[PDB]
Design an enzyme around this catalytic site. Structure first.
Site, PDB file in Angstrom:
ATOM      1  N   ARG C  86       0.511  -1.653   0.203  1.00 15.34           N
ATOM      2  CA  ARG C  86      -0.089  -0.246   0.234  1.00 15.34           C
ATOM      3  C   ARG C  86       1.040   1.161   0.539  1.00 15.34           C
ATOM      4  NH1 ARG C  86      -3.303  -3.243  -1.455  1.00 15.34           N
ATOM      5  NH2 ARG C  86      -5.220  -3.997  -0.539  1.00 15.34           N
ATOM      6  N   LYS C 114       0.298  -3.544  11.743  1.00 13.47           N
ATOM      7  CA  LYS C 114      -0.477  -2.500  12.464  1.00 13.47           C
ATOM      8  C   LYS C 114      -1.553  -1.503  12.033  1.00 13.47           C
ATOM      9  CE  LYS C 114       0.928  -0.165  15.943  1.00 13.47           C
ATOM     10  NZ  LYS C 114       1.875   1.390  16.343  1.00 13.47           N
ATOM     11  N   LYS C 126       8.876   4.139   9.983  1.00 16.92           N
ATOM     12  CA  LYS C 126       8.990   4.845  10.757  1.00 16.92           C
ATOM     13  C   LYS C 126       9.927   5.178  10.378  1.00 16.92           C
ATOM     14  CE  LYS C 126       6.814   4.810  14.977  1.00 16.92           C
ATOM     15  NZ  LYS C 126       4.942   4.342  14.964  1.00 16.92           N
ATOM     16  N   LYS C 387      -9.036  13.240   5.161  1.00 20.32           N
ATOM     17  CA  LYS C 387      -9.295  15.359   5.422  1.00 20.32           C
ATOM     18  C   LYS C 387      -8.861  16.170   3.772  1.00 20.32           C
ATOM     19  CE  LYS C 387      -9.599  18.696   8.257  1.00 20.32           C
ATOM     20  NZ  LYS C 387      -9.822  19.832   9.102  1.00 20.32           N
TER      21      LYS C 387
END
Ligand SMILES: NC(=O)C1=CN([C@@H]2O[C@H](COP(=O)(O)OP(=O)(O)OC[C@H]3O[C@@H](n4cnc5c(N)ncnc54)[C@H](O)[C@@H]3O)[C@@H](O)[C@H]2O)C=CC1
Ligand SMILES: NC(=O)C1=CN([C@@H]2O[C@H](COP(=O)(O)OP(=O)(O)OC[C@H]3O[C@@H](n4cnc5c(N)ncnc54)[C@H](O)[C@@H]3O)[C@@H](O)[C@H]2O)C=CC1
Ligand SMILES: NC(=O)C1=CN([C@@H]2O[C@H](COP(=O)(O)OP(=O)(O)OC[C@H]3O[C@@H](n4cnc5c(N)ncnc54)[C@H](O)[C@@H]3O)[C@@H](O)[C@H]2O)C=CC1
Ligand SMILES: NC(=O)C1=CN([C@@H]2O[C@H](COP(=O)(O)OP(=O)(O)OC[C@H]3O[C@@H](n4cnc5c(N)ncnc54)[C@H](O)[C@@H]3O)[C@@H](O)[C@H]2O)C=CC1
Ligand SMILES: NC(=O)C1=CN([C@@H]2O[C@H](COP(=O)(O)OP(=O)(O)OC[C@H]3O[C@@H](n4cnc5c(N)ncnc54)[C@H](O)[C@@H]3O)[C@@H](O)[C@H]2O)C=CC1
Ligand SMILES: NC(=O)C1=CN([C@@H]2O[C@H](COP(=O)(O)OP(=O)(O)OC[C@H]3O[C@@H](n4cnc5c(N)ncnc54)[C@H](O)[C@@H]3O)[C@@H](O)[C@H]2O)C=CC1
Ligand SMILES: Nc1nc2c(ncn2[C@@H]2O[C@H](COP(=O)(O)OP(=O)(O)OP(=O)(O)O)[C@@H](O)[C@H]2O)c(=O)[nH]1
Ligand SMILES: Nc1nc2c(ncn2[C@@H]2O[C@H](COP(=O)(O)OP(=O)(O)OP(=O)(O)O)[C@@H](O)[C@H]2O)c(=O)[nH]1
Ligand SMILES: Nc1nc2c(ncn2[C@@H]2O[C@H](COP(=O)(O)OP(=O)(O)OP(=O)(O)O)[C@@H](O)[C@H]2O)c(=O)[nH]1
Ligand SMILES: N[C@@H](CCC(=O)O)C(=O)O
Ligand SMILES: N[C@@H](CCC(=O)O)C(=O)O
Ligand SMILES: N[C@@H](CCC(=O)O)C(=O)O
Lengths: 501, 501, 501
Positions: C86, C114, C126, C387
């Site tokens: 992804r 996760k 990360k 958003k």
């Protein structure tokens, strides 16, 4: 291919256009109200139409691959972009040896109007790789489609804002999965909307639910909206409703198998199934699961245990509804007379030639045009595209709200009734029906595809049914659709300055 | 167009290729020295050749313009990219109604090998807009070429690192000036090398000195390097040198007018000049400056005061050197027998068909092939390209140095001689000759174009004469050149992995 | 750091993976439907898993910053991208001296799974800057994060379609505000979705409501969906419901303070709060909005008036629920035996080592895995991302419609009842409940974050519970989640051609 009637594919579709052109040309001049009120309105119209019909771009590709046997082969491959009044272009990739520039120039144009029929905001495109896909190993077909994606990407014939391919004959999920991966890993590397460059994708790759069916589902809803108008069924001498009908599908691909599934469900009865090696037959009915399970296991529909192996044309088989879901130019001047059936649902792109339409018109045989009927393919793809843009599985942000909101809405009707009928008219449970408990949380991706498709196959059918009433075309629904398409596509050009000039 | 011998243009050039393919095929297998020594070498060669022949890309364009009379017209326009073993593609834009995809697919291929002949590192491209240019006003022609630049730019068919157009039939400086300005002001806005997207540009626009001539200058150099080899002149029964020759040019364009100028200077006589309305004639000689001054004033060579109109074919005019500088397929199976003349300098692209070569071979008539002879166009364009990359008027940084350096170099030969011959030997002036005072400061842009062109019309004629000797082709120089081209173009594909795979 | 059990962080998480790998490996081979049906379904499963495990990319950065005291310091900084099945990668930026490539390679992998747990369509990433953040002034920390954003941006490790960072240990809104501003003002200047390059942003910068809490809210939802399932509470000997529980949180950061707030609200009672200088304690209960007011004023929880300082390990505090919200590898082979508590809610990333799980499994102690429980962070970030793509404050376009629509919907239930019960039966007010007056206009941004989060902490717990039942893992929820993650991540690779090849 026939020969008596094997007209040029692009010119054939131009023919369908030029007919719609004349029929609205008056109206187009009519609501145009510019200062230059004359027959300048007409020639301003007759110019903009002349801009529409021909394809804007065609890209022709001779690109090499090294086959599995170490050898080199050159692959021919084409992608016509018909119009661009809507970016991005839309339209599928077809793998066949029939592939030819005029055939892609033709299909592309169809995609332009097809999207205008069902109000998808895409310009028409299409593409062919000129290979027999049977004759290449899967590793070859991967190396072929990936390379074809590159050469298309580099010359600007695939891009989320430019041109969005999809599957078609002898292409499906797998091919689309590759087209995304290449563009995503290469040229579109930084593109956030990269994976929105191509529809028909596997669900895991960004595809949308029910897209593989979709085109065949839309085939169902298209036959439906008409077969449940006795105003047309009075003209075919048939009874309204699916319950008692019998049909036949030429082709068992993504359009065939799913047009068969969705009718054999919601009523009617499959009588015969074609394929490029022969047809099977059974007036008693053919179950789509059994047949599919037989085509998966044995790679052919021929020899189906519960159905004879029909010698003769599949298109001529006695039935109510003939669904050509094969290649184009299948019903021609010569076999169109013998078609023994009453409703023609063009699943495939332009399976009927203009001379077959004249026969079918005469013979009061209702041809549901290619523009309208298989627009379920592009419509769900159009959804798959917006999904790729909104980057959310539809429904996710809201589920536990229009849920809780409705349970609270219900709890208002309840408390309000109790608050009038006292502790002493009882307690009044307000509780969702069974067919509201399944929608209690609102739109899932499954549902949107269904209703989103259902809506515009219905809406766009009446948009055709008005226009066939309006200009009095009767069972000439093909001209009715091109009338709507030509009008919507024109609206853009007219209010635009028409070109950067 | 003829009709006994009007072969397909792309296939015609494929014919010239396939001939060269066989003749080196042995050698290509020979220096290949791979682990897999077999006739996999041969099939690994015959595959790479099968990759070369066909064009990589063709873009087809139906784009609208608004004519001057407010009306709309659709313009057809094509740009084939033949090969890309060298980016960027190179090749001109042609304005004619003859324009057809096969004709552009053909010329593009010619540009591939043409660049391989004269070691220009470009892949072959070409383009046609299918208009009669005389039938449009200059304002129309502007917004036609500008628009055509856009649609080419958007689909990746023009760009300094991608594809660099140039002029051709009915296009010149003016068109090229537009092509730059659109790309520079639009899509290439941030591109520092923007104006390097197109050659033939006006000098003020980034063009290079002598590019308009260039192609005709190279035509001079090409005839020269052969006509001054008695080894070939012994075979034509003609005397070495220009001094006494007579010549006829079909066409009076950029290639004609300047092939006429550069020969009427450096020796020979013009006898007759053709044009798409008829020819003029004068055995005594025709002055290019008078003719040109008559075509500028009156827009036709016909009715030249010092030359009557010639009854009959210009190609058949008795003369020494026939220079077709018109369109293609002019000398065919039917008029090739009647061609009076002994040297054919193909200025135009493929003006002679393969059946004319058969006759000319037999009739000991030397055809100087299109690949080699008009490669002066691309060569000087190739310079115009490097100029727009180096962003300096050539020679500027150094002039007052290889100047002062030489004057100091001379002053060393002098002081050293004085420093041996004392007083009583005198003072010994060391002073540039007249010809060396004109080079005392070194290479100007004028000079580089000349010598840079002169060099490689020489160095590449050599390479052809080696190969016509080697494989014993004699006066088949066309096959000799395609032999060099096929080898150089192959040399890339072989050492490359051939495709990203 | 412990001494007896300080396993390599990346290998630790690989350990959790390999456990889940085996448990579904059979199933993965099972639904694989290929005709290479053998135990070569197994090896191409075993290959695809071998592709998943290791990080795809790690970038290591020694970049200079000038400190406040004019001097130069070099900053070490890392960003591993685990998977990319992804795009865009997701995952936070951590400021610590513990930061090490293995630790970032580990957390990145955790982010991959996760997101697969809670169906966020991001690959795992990360990043760590290897600084003690307390030892740099805020103006130093600004020039550090801005510079780190650049060097990440240039090498393709931050971009709205590529990789979207977020806060983590010793980073929060402020840092995220900088990361956006640099990339918005620099490299992403033309990027419309520029500000979607990083989540956790301040609301005014494009952030989403409740993201700072979010992770701790999700911690509440996670403990809830289990602690309200007596099927597990029967196995811990504990009563269903929060009402009577006591908990302890190691760490008082974004995850601690808000995991404390959302439980001390919805029931249970904080007993002890840790930090990197010691713990406080009070069995009677600790109020979060006194302790926070004490940490803001005095920069330490130590010496809290209404709680003495606790005398030993915070992890060993007698309580019901232990919430490690600190760094990783906190509960090990050596202190895991003495944890005196019954539910471990891993707020922090991998605070428990595999040997601690072996003890907790034995000791019937329920560890709610890191994958599932803190996925509230990424989930609300995933919202913050959408958003910034939808460019609208959620709810705005519709508010006064699903409002007026509902009031009209209600007015239909009313008029229809009146229409049946005449003037006889009264007037029947249909009026929203109190709860429903607050939803009468539909989804605001506050609400969507809540319910959108609530749903998928609740949809994904009941994908874990009905895999822990399925393969009989019992209280091994960690293996249960990795089983889900490994399956979802697999699916992409399987249906993909797996690589450009
Ligand atoms: N995949 C999609 O979403 C869309 C496809 N279509 C159209 O449907 C038609 C084909 O359907 P596809 O989806 O490509 O599935 P497909 O490519 O799998 O269908 C072809 C199958 O039917 C058989 N067949 C092919 N041509 C035949 C012929 N002339 N006569 C008898 N049998 C034949 C072949 O043996 C083959 O197995 C085309 O016209 C296409 O444009 C349009 C709407 C959507
Ligand atoms: N590489 C990419 O970025 C691709 C784009 N997407 C985007 O994903 C967005 C959100 O919906 P979807 O992820 O398609 O889920 P979905 O719920 O619509 O269905 C996709 C299938 O994959 C499962 N799945 C859920 N999360 C997954 C994850 N992180 N990785 C792999 N599989 C997962 C789902 O449970 C489901 O079975 C879409 O809007 C789409 O644009 C999804 C596929 C590939
Ligand atoms: N402009 C350049 O730098 C290069 C052009 N060429 C080729 O030169 C040839 C044409 O000359 P250009 O300078 O390009 O353009 P041009 O249009 O200036 O010259 C062509 C001339 O020949 C006339 N003509 C065209 N077709 C004719 C026909 N069938 N019969 C008699 N006359 C005809 C035309 O009226 C025109 O006067 C073409 O083959 C062109 O591709 C090749 C090398 C470089
Ligand atoms: N808009 C344009 O003209 C563009 C052209 N260029 C570059 O301009 C460079 C300079 O080549 P030139 O100096 O023109 O060749 P040049 O060899 O002719 O330079 C010397 C002579 O050219 C004339 N000249 C020089 N610069 C001029 C200028 N800017 N405008 C008008 N006349 C000028 C002068 O009269 C001078 O005597 C080219 O190499 C090209 O790379 C690149 C960007 C834009
Ligand atoms: N903010 C987010 O998005 C989420 C963060 N997490 C994880 O939760 C943990 C906490 O980080 P955040 O709350 O995000 O920010 P944070 O940096 O503000 O929280 C850190 C707290 O833990 C303390 N601490 C550090 N080392 C300690 C130690 N050995 N023993 C006891 N206390 C110690 C710190 O002094 C502070 O009290 C991290 O491991 C993080 O990966 C997990 C998912 C979401
Ligand atoms: N700047 C960005 O991050 C970019 C993203 N967007 C999106 O557009 C929408 C922006 O709406 P919001 O201002 O966030 O919601 P909003 O209008 O409801 O206000 C929320 C917060 O923004 C501030 N605010 C309130 N009214 C404001 C106003 N008229 N102008 C500027 N700030 C105001 C206040 O700090 C308040 O706390 C968001 O969806 C955003 O993601 C659009 C362009 C760029
Ligand atoms: N090959 C094949 N595909 C099917 C069959 N049935 C359904 N599909 C497709 O597989 C997908 C999964 O279908 P379902 O899980 O049953 O969901 P659905 O919304 O009820 O789908 P439909 O009933 O086909 O409209 C759907 O998108 C269908 O298009 C089948 O029998 N054979
Ligand atoms: N169109 C045209 N241009 C000319 C002519 N003569 C000279 N020029 C241009 O002016 C420049 C100076 O010309 P010359 O003094 O004769 O030197 P030159 O460069 O050796 O001449 P040419 O190569 O024949 O052009 C040339 O480089 C040409 O570009 C001519 O007769 N016709
Ligand atoms: N640090 C801190 N923030 C708070 C506190 N109380 C409320 N907030 C802020 O308020 C936001 C959401 O609060 P509300 O709008 O009041 O929502 P609510 O349903 O009334 O209840 P909460 O979300 O628990 O506060 C949180 O994300 C915090 O930013 C508090 O005690 N401490
Ligand atoms: N190839 C199908 C689908 C096109 C698409 O979904 O983009 C058609 O022509 O209708
Ligand atoms: N059109 C000329 C010139 C091409 C160029 O200079 O790029 C040719 O084909 O040779
Ligand atoms: N750092 C947090 C948040 C990640 C995110 O929201 O992108 C985590 O690892 O879960």
């Amino acid at each position: 291919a026939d020969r008596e009637d094997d007209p040029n594919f692009f010119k054939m579709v131009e023919g369908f256009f030029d007919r719609g052109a004349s029929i609205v040309e008056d109206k187009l001049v009519e609501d145009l109200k510019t200062r230059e009120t004359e027959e300048q309105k007409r020639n301003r119209v007759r110019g903009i139409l002349r801009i529409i019909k021909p394809c804007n771009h065609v890209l022709s590709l001779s690109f090499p691959i090294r086959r599995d046997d170490g050898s080199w082969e050159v692959i021919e491959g084409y992608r016509a972009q018909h119009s661009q009044h809507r970016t991005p272009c839309k339209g599928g990739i077809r793998y066949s040896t029939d592939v030819s520039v005029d055939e892609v120039k033709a299909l592309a144009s169809l995609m332009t109007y097809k999207c205008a029929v069902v109000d998808v905001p895409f310009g028409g495109a299409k593409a062919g790789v000129k290979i027999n896909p049977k004759n290449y190993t899967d590793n070859e077909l991967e190396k072929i489609t990936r390379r074809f994606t590159m050469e298309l990407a580099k010359k600007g014939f695939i891009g989320p804002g430019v041109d969005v391919p999809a599957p078609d004959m002898s292409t499906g999920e797998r091919e689309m999965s590759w087209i995304a991966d290449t563009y995503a890993s290469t040229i579109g590397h930084y593109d956030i909307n990269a994976h929105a460059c191509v529809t028909g994708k596997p669900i895991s790759q960004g595809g949308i639910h029910g897209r593989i069916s979709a085109t065949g589902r839309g085939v169902f809803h298209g036959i439906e909206n008409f077969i449940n108008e006795a105003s047309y069924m009075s003209i075919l001498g048939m009874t309204p409703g699916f319950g008692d009908k019998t049909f036949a599908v030429q082709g068992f691909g993504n359009v065939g198998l799913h047009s068969m599934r969705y009718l054999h469900r919601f009523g009617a009865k499959c009588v015969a199934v074609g394929e490029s090696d022969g047809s099977i037959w059974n007036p008693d009915g053919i179950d789509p699961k059994e047949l599919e399970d037989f085509k998966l296991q044995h790679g052919t529909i021929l020899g189906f245990p519960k159905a004879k192996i029909y010698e003769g044309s599949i298109l001529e088989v006695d039935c109510d509804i003939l669904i050509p879901a094969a290649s184009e130019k299948q019903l021609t001047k010569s076999n169109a007379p013998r078609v023994k059936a009453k409703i023609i649902a063009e699943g495939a792109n332009g399976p009927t030639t203009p001379e077959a339409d004249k026969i079918f018109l005469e013979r009061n045989i209702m041809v549901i045009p290619d523009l309208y009927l298989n627009a379920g393919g592009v419509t769900v793809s159009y959804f798959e595209w917006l999904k790729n843009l909104n980057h959310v599985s539809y429904g996710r942000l809201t589920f536990k709200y229009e849920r809780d909101s409705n349970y609270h809405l219900l709890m208002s009707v309840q408390e309000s009734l109790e608050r009038k009928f006292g502790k002493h008219g009882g307690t009044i449970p307000i509780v969702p029906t069974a067919e509201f408990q399944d929608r209690i949380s609102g739109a899932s991706e499954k549902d949107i595809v269904h209703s989103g498709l259902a809506y515009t196959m219905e809406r766009s059918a009446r948009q055709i049914m008005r226009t066939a009433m309006k200009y009095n075309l009767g069972l000439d629904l093909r001209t009715a659709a091109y009338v709507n398409a030509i009008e919507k596509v024109f609206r853009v050009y007219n209010e635009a300055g028409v070109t950067f000039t």
